[PDB]
Every structure is written in C-alpha cells, then in structure tokens.
C-alpha cells in the first residue's frame, strides 16, 4: 500500500529473476489516463436533509448528477442505497439542491 515503494504508480504484483551477483524485479503497475473534466459538489440537499456519498464522489456533466468511484468513470443514478443522510444542511458550503 505504501506508494512509490515498488513500482511507479498503483502496484499490482511482481516477479523475481536471477542474475550473476544480484536480483532483478519486474513490477507490474497500473496507470490511468484519458482524463475528463466534470462539475462537482460536496453534498446534496433534498427535502431539507443533507445527503453524502457512501464511497466515491458526486459529479455532473451539466444537466444530471451522478455518483462515481474515484479511480474510474462509471455513472450510477443517485438512490437511497449508496448515499447516507446526516442532519439538516444550513452550514455546509457548496450544497446544491436536487
């Protein structure tokens, strides 16, 4: 889990090899690319209550709001199963109604 210990990026696995007076490692690493840009928000106020994501983050492409994980782009409709509620929202900065 310690970043940049073995490899360069997220780590998966390794293979050892022999040598005359040493050892050779072949680290197999995972690296993302082909990024996109979206408009975010920290939480959603609905019916006076603040909803937060269980895991991931809220995103939007301009017209609809989705929840996605943090290392890949897969959209899911917002429901009451992947979000949790915590009190009423009057002090959170950045809320957006939906």
């Amino acid at each position: 889990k310690r970043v940049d210990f073995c490899g360069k990026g997220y780590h998966l696995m390794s293979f050892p090899q022999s040598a005359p007076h040493g050892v050779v490692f072949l680290h197999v690493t995972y690296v993302p690319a082909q990024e996109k840009n979206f408009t975010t928000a920290p939480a959603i106020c609905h019916d006076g209550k603040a909803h937060f994501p269980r895991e991931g983050v809220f995103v939007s492409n301009g017209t609809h709001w989705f929840v996605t994980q943090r290392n890949f782009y897969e959209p899911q409709i917002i429901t009451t199963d992947n979000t949790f509620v915590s009190g009423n929202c009057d002090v959170v900065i950045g809320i957006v109604n939906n």
Binding site: R2, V3, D4, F5
Partner: protein, 50 residues
C-alpha cells in the same frame, strides 16, 4: 642526510592523510544512510498518506 629527514616527514604526513581519508569515508557512509531515510520519508509521507 636530507633524504633521511624527508623520509621522516613523508611517512608522518602519510599517516596523517590516511587517517583523515578513513574518517571522511565513515562519515560519508553515515550521511548516505540518513539521506536514504529522508528520501523514503519524502516519497512516502508527501505524495500520499501514511
């Protein structure tokens, strides 16, 4: 006899220089170890969370 005297001076200064070089090597090894530790700390605690 100047050659005898010069031999005395040369041998004395040779031992002095050897001692200095050995001390330098030891200190350099220690500093290299500390630098490696610092590099690990910078690569781990900065670019991520520990």
């Amino acid at each position: 006899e100047a050659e005898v005297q010069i031999d005395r001076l040369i041998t004395g200064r040779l031992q002095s220089l050897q001692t200095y070089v050995t001390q330098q090597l030891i200190r350099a090894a220690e500093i290299r170890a500390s630098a490696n530790l610092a590099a690990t700390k910078m690569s781990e605690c900065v670019l991520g969370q520990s």
